[PDB]
Design a protein around this nucleic acid. Structure first.
Lengths: 27, 173, 83, 1186, 92
RNA sequence: GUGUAGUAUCUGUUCUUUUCAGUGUAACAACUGAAAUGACCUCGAGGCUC
RNA sequence: UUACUAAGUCUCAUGUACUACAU
C-alpha cells in the first residue's frame, strides 16, 4: 500500500468527476 | 468466516453437514476431521463460509437450533511489557502491587508472585514500554515496606531491546 | 550404464542441436539460446520476416533478415553503438 | 447434453502471394511435340507453388500445383548433363528433388528422391534456408543458418542417384548468404559469410570452401575477416581473360568489395548515392546481386535497398597491367526485388519481395564503361557519386506484371453477399477490391421502357451470313422487337399485343413465336419483312402454360389436358403435329428440352404439385419422378459438350436452385445437387463461353448466379452486377467473347462481358513505365452507420505525413471542389486510427500520432455535390502509442500500453470518461474487440486474450476469464458472446471458449457483484486462487476449442452471417503475406465424420502408396510420393500446437486432382460411400457453404 | 536400443543407402522395436555401409540381413526417424 | 518335504567426540581435520568474565 | 473445542517374499 467530467466553459475537460460534482452542489 | 461446530454425533457425515448448513448459507469449505486412532469422526467440525457476514449469521440462527441424533448442535466463532522485580517484602500483596504500578501504567494482566533461591519476586505486565520505563525509573532500587526492591525487565535475553520498543510501539498503535 | 549412455547422447544431441540445458547452465548461456532460436524463427519464416519488416519500417526486407542474423551475436549491440 | 465442439472447415480461397523462391529450369514440354528451350520459371511461396512460362515475351500461368503442406525454405533448379527438374528443400529437412511431369490431362509434380535431414521443424541446425546447386549440376549444397553444412554429390543414371552427404560442422559459426561459384568442372566451390555466435566482439568473416571431388570432402580454403558491416556474396564467373582462382563480390552497406581466393586482389568501390536522401537515410546495402555473361562481356546487377539497380564490368587496366577493375553505373532501378533471373532470352525476371513480380527486356543495357562521369572505378577506392533517380525508364522496359499482394496490412469486407474484399495495394497504392463474384464488364447500356420481363436473342434469318441478329424483349401486355448489328442497334408484324411465352429459330431461316393465346410461324421475306406461314390456336381456346424447343423440334403445353409436339419437315420449311394425347395426368407446370441439337431425347416436364417427370422421345414414357419442395419456378435442360452429360437444371420458387445428372438411356434422376440463393422465384437462361469452349446457366434472383461446370467440377456463383432481370449470350463485331446482352431489374437494357471465373485455383478477380507511390498504406476503416463506406489511411516514407482517401460505391470521392481525390495531412503520422460516431448525425475520425497525440477529425459527404470534407477538431495528448482502439457505445474505447481508457466527447478536446487498470500480466494491447458493448476480449503482445465486462455504475471493465497458454495475438474477433477468434504473430489460427462454469455464473449474476460483492464460486476455483494465484488470478480459464496453423500471419478476421446467402455463417481471414481463407462450422456430425475420414485418408495416402509399392516389390516410388514432401499433414498443420477440432479442407481438396485409379485406390479403405460421393461431399463446401 | 541399454547408436546424417535387417529381426522398428504399422525405410550414413559390414543387420549387428528396416508411425511422429543413423556398434 | 551362494522388504531396538573450521547439502544430513585447563556468579540456560 | 501429520539413521532379533545355483 484521472477522469474528466467536462465543465461548461469547455475548459473542464481537465476537471475531475468529484470536482464537477462539487460544482453541481455549487451550481 | 470459519465457524466451529461441536457436540456432533460421529454418525453425522460430511454430506449431512453440507446439506445441513447450505440451508443456512453457502458453504465454501468443510473440514470435518477423521480420527486415525478410532477410524471414524471425533464429533466436531469446522465450516468455512464465504464471509464473516454469513458466518456470524449462521452463528446466530444455527446455535442451539438443529437436533441431530438427539444431541444438540453447538456453534462457536473461531506481546506486552513484562518487568521482573526482585527482593519484595513478604507484606506486599498482589493487590498492593497493582496499586503501586497503576500510578505508573495500566496493567494488561495481574502480577505474578513467585519465590526464587526465599527470594520474593514478581512479574508485572505493562501495556506500555514507556510507562514501564517510568515504573523502572522511579521504582528501581527503592525501599518499599522497609525492603529494597529491584525493578528491571523480565527475560524472554531480557525484554527492552531496540526492536522491542519498535514493535511494542506498534502493538500500542 | 544406462545413465552413462544418457551422458553420451547428451553430448551428441548437444552437438547437433547446439544448446540443450544439461544440469547447470548459466543464464547467459541459456538466454543466448533463447535469443538465437527466437531470431532464428523470426528470420526463418518468410511470414514473420515480412511482418517484422513492415512493423519495423526498414527500406528493404533483407535488411531485417540480416539484421536478425547480426543480432544473433552479442557484440552486435556495441556494433550498433559504434555507428 | 449437446457437445459444443465447434467444427471448423478451413479453406484457402486465395493462395499465399509473397514469392520467396524461383528457379530458371525448363520442366515440362507442352503443346510442342519436340521442343527444348531454357526459357521458363517456377516460383514458390512456402506451401503454394506456381509454374510460369514466357516464350512470348509475356508471362503465362502454366499450372497452379497442388498444395504441398510444408514450408519451402529454399528452391533451386538443377541442370545435369535432359529435362531440368528442380531441387526443393523445405521443413522436415528432406531434400526433395522433384520433376514436373504431365500425368493424365494435367501437370502434376512428381518427386524423385527425398533425403532425410535434421528433424521436422524450422530450425537453426536444420540444413535448409541456405541452398544452392553447382551451375553445372554436379552437386547440391544445403547449409544451416548456424551449425552445419551438408553437400550431396548428385549423379544421374537410369534412376537418379544422390550421393551420401558431405558434412562440415562449425559449432559457433552462424552462416549467412550462401553463394556458389561456377566452375569449369575443375571442382565445386561455394562461399559463405560466417558470423561467430559466441564472441566478445562482433566479427563477420567470409570463408571459401572447395569441395574436392577427388578426396570427397569439403575443404576450408581462405578465411578472410571483413568488417562486421558485411552483407552478401556474389560469384564472379571466371576472369579468365584477366589476372583456379575465383573472385567474389562482397556487398557491404555503404560500399562494395570484391575479393580474390588467394587474397591477392581486394578491390573497394564505393556505391553511389541518391541526390535527395529523403529523411531517414541508412548506409543502405545491396539486397540482390546477379551475374550475366555474353560475348566476352559479363556484367552483374546489384540492387540497393532503395531499389537502385547497378551493374559491374571488369577492366584490365591496360596501362598498369592486366588486373581486374570494378565499375559501377546506374540503371532504370526498380522496386526492391528479392531475387533476379535472366533467361537465355534478353528477358530479366524481377521477383519483388515487396509486391509484384515483373519481367523485362533490356535494350539500352546501360551506359558504356568509357564514360568517366557517371561510372566509378577501382582506380580510387575513396570517392562518391551522387545521382538523381530516373523515372523516365530508359534502360529497362516492363513487359509483364503479376498482380499480387505480398504485404496486405488491413482490409474491410465490402458487399458481404459477393464476399468482396477491399484492401490497399502496398507499393502502387491503388484500391484493390478482390471479389468472389464473376468479373462482369458493362458497355453501351440503353434505357428500355419500364416493366420488362424476359429476353431472347435469335439470329436474324432475313440476312444470311450477316451480323444482324434479332433481340426480343417482352412486357406483360406488349412485346418489343429489336435489330442488332455492329455499332448499329435499331428498332422495328409478329404479335405486339400479347406476351411471348417462347420464341426460337427452326432449322434454317425460320422462326416460331409461341404466345399465350396463339402461336405464330414466321419466315423471313426480303430484308425488313417476315411472313407467318401458319398459326396455331387451341381448338376451343386456352391459355398456353409453357413452351420449349429444340433446333428442329418444338413442344408447347396448354392449360391442362394435353401437350403438343411439333417438328419441322426436312428439305423444306413446315410444321406438323402428331395425333395423340400426352395427357400428363396433371396440369403441366413448365417444359424443358435440349435446344443444342436438332433432336433431343427425354423431355423434362414439371408439375405444379412440385414433381418432375421425364418423357422418353417406345416414344413417350415416364421413367422417373421427383417430389421436391415448392412448385418449380423455372427449369432448363442442358447437355454439355465435353463429357456429354445431360444435366437438368431445375430452379424452384422461393430461391432454391437445383441440378441433376440425367442418364441418356434410362433417363433416371440421380446426383441431386442443390443450393439456396436469395429469396425470390428464380429464373434460368443458357449461355456459352470459354473461360476451351464452355457453357453455363445464368440464374436471376435477388442476386445473379452463374452456374458453370469446369472439368469434373461445377460452381454456382454470384455476379459482380447487383441484379440482372434476363440474360442471353451476345456477339458483336466489336470484339465480343463471353459477351452477353441482358437487362437489369430496373428494366434497362445493358450489354456486358464476363471475364474471370472463380475456379478452384483462383476463386477471385482482382480489381485495382514503373509506378511506385511514396505513400505506403497503413490501415482501412469503414463507417458503422453507412453499411459500406470505406475510408483509407496511408503514410509517407520520409518526413512524417499522411493521406486519407474515402471511397463509397463505385470510385472514391473528390475532396471538396478540388481536383484531388485524396487528402494530405502534413506532420500527422498514424500509428493506429479508427472512425467513431459520437452522435448518430455526426461522424468523426480518430488518429493516433507517433508524437503520442490523439487527433480528432470530422467527415463530410457532399451528396450530389458529393465529396469528402475532413475537418480537424481537437488535440489531445496520450501517454501510450495506442496500438488498439474501437467503438464502444457513444464512446471511444481505446487501449493504452498498460491500461484501457474509455474516452467520451468533450469540447475543445476529448475527455477520459473511465479508466480500467489491467491485470499485471498485460504489458501491451495489440488488438481487442467487443461483443454487443457488454463484453470485451483484450489481446497482448506477450500474453494471450483476456475478456472483460463493462459494468455500468461501476464504470469499469472487470476481467472474468484468463487464457490457458501464452499466445501472441495479432488480430482478434468474436464469433459469439462466449467464444473468441484469434491469430498469432507466428501463424496460429485459434478459437477459444469460456467454460460453462463461467457462463452459468455470468448468465445468473450481475457484473457489479464480480469485483466486489458476493459471488459463490465452487471450492476448486478458490483453491486454485490460493494454490496458483498467477495463472488463476482471473479465476477462469479458456478451454481450447479450435486450434489451427496457417503459415501466414492473419491480418483481418471477419465473421459473416452468410457467405453469398449460404446458411452456415463463416469467418474469413486475410493474412499479411496475403491469403484469404475461411472456417466453416459444420452442422450435424456425419459431415465432420465423412470429412474427417477423407482427411485421414489423404493424410497417410503417400504412405499407403509406399506400402503397396513395397508389397509389390516383395512379390517382385519413394515414401513422399503423394505428398511430394516429407511433412505429414497432422504434423505440419499441428506444428506449434495440435489442431483440436479443426479439420483441414485444403487437404481433402487435393483428393480432387488425383487420377481415378489413385482415388479409387484410396477410398477402398472405407466401408462408406464411393469415390463419386466423396467428390460430391468435397465439392459441396464451395457450392453450398459459400 | 529401447530395451538393451548398453547398445550404442551411430546418429550421423543418413545417406541414400537403406539399412538391412535379417529375417530374424524382421519387423522391428530399429528404435522402439515395434511391429506395428511401419512407415519409412531406414537410411544409414555411408560410414556404416562400405564393405561386408553393410550386409549386417542394423539391429543385431551380427547376421546378414535381406530385409529393409522401417520406422514405425510412432517414431516417425516422434521424429526419431530423422534423428540420425541407427546402428548398433557394440554387440552388447 | 531339500542344500549351496545371494537379494529385497517389515517390525523391534537405539542414539553415537560437548565444540569449532572446511567440503557437502535446497537446508539438513553425511564426510573431512583439531581439541582445554582452571576459577567465580544467578535461575540445563546465561558471561563486552578473567 | 484436539483446528487435522508422523516414521527415519544404528544395533541386534523376529515377520515375509525373492534371485542365480545343485540334487
Amino acid at each position: 500500500q484521472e477522469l474528466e467530467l467536462e465543465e461548461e466553459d469547455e475548459e473542464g475537460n481537465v476537471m475531475s468527476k468529484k470536482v464537477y460534482d462539487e460544482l453541481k452542489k455549487q451550481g | 468466516n470459519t465457524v466451529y461446530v461441536g457436540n456432533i454425533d460421529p454418525r453425522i457425515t460430511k454430506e449431512q453437514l453440507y446439506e445441513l448448513f447450505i440451508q443456512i448459507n453457502p458453504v465454501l469449505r468443510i473440514k470435518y476431521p477423521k480420527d486415525k486412532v478410532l477410524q471414524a469422526y471425533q464429533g466436531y467440525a469446522f465450516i468455512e463460509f464465504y464471509n464473516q457476514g454469513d458466518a456470524q449469521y449462521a452463528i446466530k440462527i444455527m446455535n442451539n437450533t438443529v437436533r441431530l441424533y438427539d444431541r444438540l448442535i453447538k456453534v462457536r466463532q473461531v506481546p506486552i511489557a513484562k518487568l521482573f522485580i526482585k527482593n519484595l517484602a513478604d507484606s506486599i500483596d498482589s493487590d498492593q502491587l497493582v496499586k503501586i504500578f497503576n500510578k505508573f501504567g495500566k496493567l494488561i494482566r495481574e502480577p505474578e508472585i513467585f519465590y526464587l533461591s526465599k527470594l520474593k519476586c514478581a512479574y508485572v505486565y505493562f501495556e506500555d514500554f514507556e510507562k514501564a520505563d517510568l515504573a523502572i525509573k522511579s521504582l528501581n532500587n527503592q525501599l518499599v515496606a522497609n525492603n529494597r526492591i529491584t525493578v528491571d525487565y523480565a527475560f524472554k535475553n531480557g525484554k527492552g531491546n531496540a526492536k522491542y520498543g519498535d514493535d511494542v510501539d506498534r502493538l500500542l498503535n | 550404464a544406462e545413465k552413462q549412455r544418457q551422458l553420451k547422447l547428451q553430448k551428441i544431441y548437444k552437438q547437433k542441436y547446439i544448446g540443450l540445458g544439461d544440469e547447470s547452465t548459466t543464464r547467459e548461456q541459456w538466454q543466448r539460446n533463447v535469443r538465437n532460436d527466437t531470431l532464428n524463427t523470426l528470420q526463418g519464416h518468410s511470414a514473420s520476416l515480412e511482418y517484422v519488416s513492415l512493423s519495423r519500417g526498414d527500406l528493404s526486407i533483407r535488411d531485417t533478415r540480416i539484421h536478425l542474423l547480426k543480432s544473433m551475436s552479442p557484440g552486435y549491440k556495441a556494433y550498433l553503438r559504434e555507428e | 447434453a449437446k457437445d459444443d465442439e465447434l467444427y471448423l472447415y478451413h479453406l484457402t480461397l486465395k493462395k499465399q502471394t509473397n514469392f520467396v523462391h524461383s528457379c530458371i529450369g525448363h520442366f515440362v514440354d507442352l503443346e510442342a511435340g519436340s521442343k527444348r528451350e531454357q526459357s521458363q520459371l517456377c516460383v514458390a511461396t512456402e506451401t503454394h507453388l506456381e509454374l510460369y512460362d514466357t516464350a512470348d515475351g509475356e508471362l503465362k500461368l502454366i499450372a497452379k500445383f497442388q498444395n504441398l503442406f510444408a514450408t519451402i525454405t529454399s528452391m533451386k533448379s538443377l541442370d545435369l548433363p535432359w529435362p531440368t527438374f528442380l531441387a526443393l528443400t523445405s521443413d522436415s529437412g528432406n531434400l526433395s528433388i522433384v520433376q514436373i511431369i504431365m500425368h493424365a490431362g494435367a501437370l502434376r509434380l512428381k518427386t524423385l528422391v527425398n533425403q532425410p535431414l535434421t528433424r521436422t521443424t524450422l530450425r537453426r541446425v536444420s540444413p535448409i534456408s541456405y541452398m544452392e546447386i553447382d551451375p553445372n549440376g554436379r552437386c547440391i549444397i544445403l547449409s544451416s543458418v548456424e551449425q552445419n553444412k551438408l553437400c550431396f554429390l548428385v549423379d544421374y543414371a537410369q534412376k537418379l542417384r544422390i550421393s551420401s552427404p558431405l558434412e562440415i560442422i562449425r559449432p559457433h559459426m552462424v552462416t549467412l548468404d550462401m553463394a556458389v561459384v561456377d566452375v569449369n568442372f575443375n571442382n565445386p566451390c561455394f562461399v559463405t559469410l560466417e558470423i561467430d555466435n559466441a564472441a566478445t566482439q562482433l566479427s563477420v568473416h567470409l570463408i571459401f570452401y572447395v569441395l574436392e571431388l577427388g578426396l570427397n570432402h569439403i575443404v576450408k580454403k581462405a578465411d578472410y575477416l571483413v568488417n562486421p558491416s558485411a552483407n552478401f556474396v556474389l560469384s564472379l564467373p571466371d576472369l579468365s581473360r584477366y589476372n583456379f582462382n575465383p573472385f567474389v563480390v562482397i556487398g557491404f552497406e555503404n560500399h562494395i568489395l570484391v575479393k580474390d581466393m588467394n587474397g591477392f586482389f581486394s578491390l573497394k568501390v564505393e556505391i553511389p548515392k541518391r541526390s535527395i536522401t529523403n529523411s531517414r537515410h541508412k548506409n543502405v546495402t545491396i539486397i540482390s546481386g546477379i551475374v550475366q555473361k555474353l560475348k566476352n562481356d559479363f556484367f552483374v546487377l546489384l540492387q540497393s535497398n532503395h531499389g537502385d539497380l547497378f551493374k559491374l564490368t571488369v577492366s584490365p587496366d591496360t596501362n598498369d597491367r592486366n588486373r581486374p577493375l570494378v565499375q559501377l553505373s546506374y540503371f532504370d532501378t526498380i522496386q526492391n526485388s528479392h531475387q533476379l533471373h535472366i533467361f537465355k532470352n534478353g528477358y530479366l525476371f524481377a521477383l519483388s519481395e515487396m509486391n509484384n513480380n515483373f519481367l523485362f527486356q533490356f535494350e539500352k543495357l546501360g551506359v558504356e564503361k568509357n564514360d568517366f562521369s557517371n561510372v566509378l572505378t577501382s582506380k580510387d577506392p575513396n570517392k562518391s557519386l551522387v545521382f538523381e533517380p530516373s523515372i523516365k525508364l530508359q534502360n529497362l522496359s516492363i513487359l509483364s506484371q503479376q498482380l499480387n499482394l505480398n504485404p496486405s496490412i488491413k482490409s474491410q469486407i465490402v458487399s458481404d453477399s459477393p464476399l468482396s474484399i477491399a484492401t490497399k495495394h502496398f507499393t502502387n497504392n491503388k484500391i484493390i477490391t478482390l471479389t468472389n463474384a464473376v468479373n462482369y464488364s458493362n458497355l453501351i447500356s440503353t434505357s428500355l421502357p419500364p416493366n420488362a420481363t424476359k429476353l431472347w436473342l435469335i439470329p436474324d434469318p432475313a440476312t444470311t451470313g450477316d451480323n444482324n441478329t434479332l433481340l426480343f424483349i417482352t412486357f406483360p401486355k406488349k412485346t418489343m422487337i429489336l435489330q442488332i448489328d455492329n455499332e448499329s442497334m435499331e428498332e422495328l408484324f409478329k404479335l405486339s399485343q400479347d406476351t411471348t411465352i417462347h420464341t426460337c429459330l427452326m432449322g434454317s431461316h425460320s422462326i416460331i413465336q409461341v404466345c399465350t393465346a396463339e402461336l405464330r410461324h414466321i419466315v423471313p421475306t426480303g430484308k425488313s419483312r417476315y411472313s407467318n406461314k401458319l398459326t396455331w390456336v387451341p381448338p376451343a381456346g386456352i391459355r398456353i402454360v409453357c413452351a420449349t424447343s429444340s433446333k428442329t423440334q418444338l413442344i408447347i403445353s396448354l392449360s391442362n389436358y394435353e401437350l403438343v409436339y411439333f417438328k419441322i419437315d426436312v428439305s423444306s420449311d413446315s410444321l406438323i403435329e402428331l395425333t395423340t394425347h400426352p395427357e400428363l395426368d396433371t396440369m403441366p407446370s413448365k417444359v424443358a428440352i435440349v435446344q443444342d441439337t436438332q433432336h433431343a431425347d427425354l423431355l423434362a416436364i414439371a408439375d405444379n404439385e412440385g414433381m418432375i417427370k421425364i418423357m422418353s422421345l417406345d416414344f413417350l414414357t415416364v421413367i422417373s419422378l421427383q417430389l421436391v419442395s415448392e412448385k418449380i419456378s423455372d427449369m432448363i435442360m442442358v447437355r454439355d459438350s465435353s463429357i456429354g452429360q445431360l444435366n437438368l437444371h431445375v430452379g424452384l420458387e422461393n430461391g432454391v436452385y437445383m441440378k441433376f445428372h440425367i442418364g441418356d438411356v434410362d433417363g433416371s434422376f440421380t446426383d441431386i445437387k442443390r443450393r439456396f440463393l436469395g429469396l425470390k422465384p428464380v429464373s434460368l437462361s443458357y449461355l456459352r463461353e470459354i473461360s476451351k469452349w464452355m457453357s453455363c446457366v445464368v440464374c436471376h434472383s435477388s442476386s445473379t448466379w452463374v452456374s458453370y461446370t469446369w472439368k469434373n467440377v461445377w460452381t454456382i456463383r454470384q455476379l459482380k452486377d447487383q441484379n440482372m432481370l434476363s440474360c442471353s449470350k451476345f456477339v458483336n463485331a466489336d470484339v465480343a467473347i463471353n459477351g452477353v446482352c441482358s437487362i437489369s431489374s430496373s428494366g434497362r437494357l445493358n450489354i456486358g462481358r464476363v471475364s474471370n471465373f472463380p475456379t478452384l485455383d483462383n476463386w477471385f478477380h482482382v480489381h485495382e513505365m514503373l509506378q511506385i507511390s511514396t505513400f505506403r498504406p497503413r490501415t482501412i476503416l469503414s463507417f458503422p452507420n453507412n453499411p459500406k463506406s470505406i475510408l483509407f489511411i496511408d503514410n509517407h516514407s520520409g518526413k512524417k505525413q499522411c493521406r486519407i482517401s474515402l471511397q463509397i460505391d463505385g470510385e472514391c470521392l473528390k475532396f471538396g471542389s478540388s481536383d484531388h481525390l485524396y487528402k494530405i495531412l502534413d506532420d500527422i503520422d498514424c500509428v493506429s486510427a479508427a472512425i467513431i460516431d459520437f452522435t448518430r448525425q455526426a461522424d468523426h475520425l480518430i488518429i493516433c500520432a507517433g508524437d503520442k497525440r490523439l487527433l480528432t477529425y470530422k467527415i463530410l459527404v457532399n451528396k450530389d455535390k458529393l465529396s469528402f470534407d475532413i475537418e480537424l477538431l481537437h488535440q489531445t495528448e496520450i501517454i501510450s502509442p495506442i496500438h488498439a482502439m474501437l467503438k464502444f457505445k457513444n464512446f471511444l474505447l481505446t487501449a493504452m500500453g498498460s491500461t484501457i481508457v474509455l474516452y467520451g466527447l468533450g469540447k475543445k478536446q476529448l475527455l477520459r470518461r473511465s479508466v480500467t487498470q489491467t491485470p499485471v500480466s498485460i504489458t501491451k494491447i495489440v488488438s481487442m474487440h467487443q461483443w454487443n458493448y457488454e463484453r470485451l476480449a483484450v489481446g497482448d503482445i506477450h500474453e494471450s486474450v483476456t475478456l472483460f465486462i463493462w459494468d455500468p455504475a461501476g464504470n469499469v471493465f472487470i476481467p472474468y476469464v484468463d487464457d490457458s497458454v501464452k499466445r501472441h495475438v495479432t488480430v482478434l474477433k468474436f464469433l459469439d458472446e462466449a467464444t473468441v477468434i484469434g491469430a498469432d504473430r507466428y501463424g496460429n489460427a485459434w478459437t477459444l471458449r469460456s467454460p460453462p462454469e463461467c457462463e452459468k455464473i455470468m448468465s445468473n449474476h450481475d457484473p457489479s457483484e464480480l469485483s466486489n460483492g458476493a459471488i459463490k464460486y465452487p471450492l476448486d476455483v478458490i483453491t486454485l486462487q490460493q494454490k496458483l494465484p498467477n495463472t488463476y488470478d482471473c479465476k477462469f480459464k479458456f478451454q481450447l476449442l479450435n486450434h489451427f496453423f496457417v503459415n501466414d500471419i492473419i491480418t483481418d478476421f471477419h465473421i459473416l452471417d452468410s457467405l453469398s446467402n449460404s446458411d452456415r455463417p463463416g469467418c474469413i481471414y486475410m493474412g499479411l503475406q496475403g491469403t484469404v481463407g475461411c472456417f466453416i462450422p459444420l452442422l450435424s456430425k456425419g459431415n465432420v465424420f465423412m470429412m474427417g475420414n477423407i482427411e485421414n485418408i489423404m493424410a497417410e495416402a503417400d504412405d499407403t502408396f509406399y506400402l503397396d509399392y513395397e508389397s509389390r516389390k516383395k512379390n517382385n516410388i519413394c515414401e513422399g510420393s503423394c505428398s511430394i514432401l516429407g511433412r505429414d499433414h497432422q504434423e505440419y498443420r499441428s506444428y506449434y500446437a495440435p489442431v483440436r477440432k479443426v479439420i483441414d479442407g485444403d487437404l481433402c481438396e487435393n483428393f480432387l486432382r488425383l487420377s481415378l485409379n489413385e482415388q479409387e485406390f484410396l477410398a477402398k479403405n472405407l466401408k462408406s460411400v464411393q469415390v463419386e460421393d466423396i467428390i460430391q461431399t468435397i465439392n459441396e463446401v464451395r457450392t453450398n457453404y459459400m | 536400443s529401447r530395451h538393451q541399454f548398453d547398445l550404442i547408436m551411430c546418429l550421423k546424417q543418413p545417406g541414400v543407402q537403406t539399412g538391412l535387417l535379417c529375417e530374424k529381426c524382421d519387423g522391428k522398428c530399429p528404435i522402439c522395436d515395434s511391429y506395428v504399422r511401419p512407415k519409412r525405410k531406414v537410411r544409414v550414413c555411408e560410414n556404416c555401409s562400405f564393405g561386408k559390414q553393410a550386409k549386417n543387420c542394423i539391429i543385431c549387428n551380427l547376421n546378414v540381413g535381406v530385409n529393409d528396416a522401417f520406422y514405425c508411425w510412432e517414431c516417425c511422429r516422434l521424429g526419431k526417424d530423422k534423428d540420425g543413423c541407427p546402428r548398433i556398434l557394440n554387440l552388447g
